[PDB]
Amino acid sequence: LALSLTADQMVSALLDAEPPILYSEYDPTRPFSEASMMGLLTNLADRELVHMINWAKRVPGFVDLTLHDQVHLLECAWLEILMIGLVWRSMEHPGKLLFAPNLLLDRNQGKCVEGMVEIFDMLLATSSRFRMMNLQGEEFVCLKSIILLNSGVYEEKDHIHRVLDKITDTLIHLMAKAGLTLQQQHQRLAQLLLILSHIRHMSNKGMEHLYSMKCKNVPLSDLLLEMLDAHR
């Protein structure tokens, strides 16, 4: 059924399934602390996870998969998906990361948490890259779906690959519609997918640091704790 979707129907499907932009519990009066900001991000991520799961079900081909396979893909891709989301909404905010409408931060405030500045700069660079490319929302939702299906795909792995091929066709269809030459289409498609390599990298570094402070004990919620264990 997901393979019977044309390019346009694929786009509208992904757009309609798009989760909302959630607010943080940021208190502009309360002084910042390493525990609180990470707490804010942890609290926000936990609420976004609920939307992401239901968003995942509306991604064409995902519900056709085995329950255990759905679980695996999400466990693998959840932080990548949160990051590309963050990066996307931060496009129109040069030098700043929009974690939430009420939580807009430059790198100086990222220094509040020890060592966050490294992953902060990578996210900024990614968002800057998207802005320079002038990434479209139609392209964004395709990329995010690719992450979900691709990140944990390594015995009827063929369906997933068939769906991934459909998303590729959808991306190309968008670029041809925007007036890009064949050479331009192939190059842009490549540029977009190469960024997914950096998003994977940022995810891995992120998980690493997350798993470290799980042992440091100093507010992870129960679904977020089971996500972390999937990487350890």
Partner: peptide, 10 residues
């Protein structure tokens, strides 16, 4: 068993 499993299951 997992929370994610239950949520995906509903």
């Amino acid at each position: 068993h997992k929370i994610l499993h239950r949520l995906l299951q509903d």
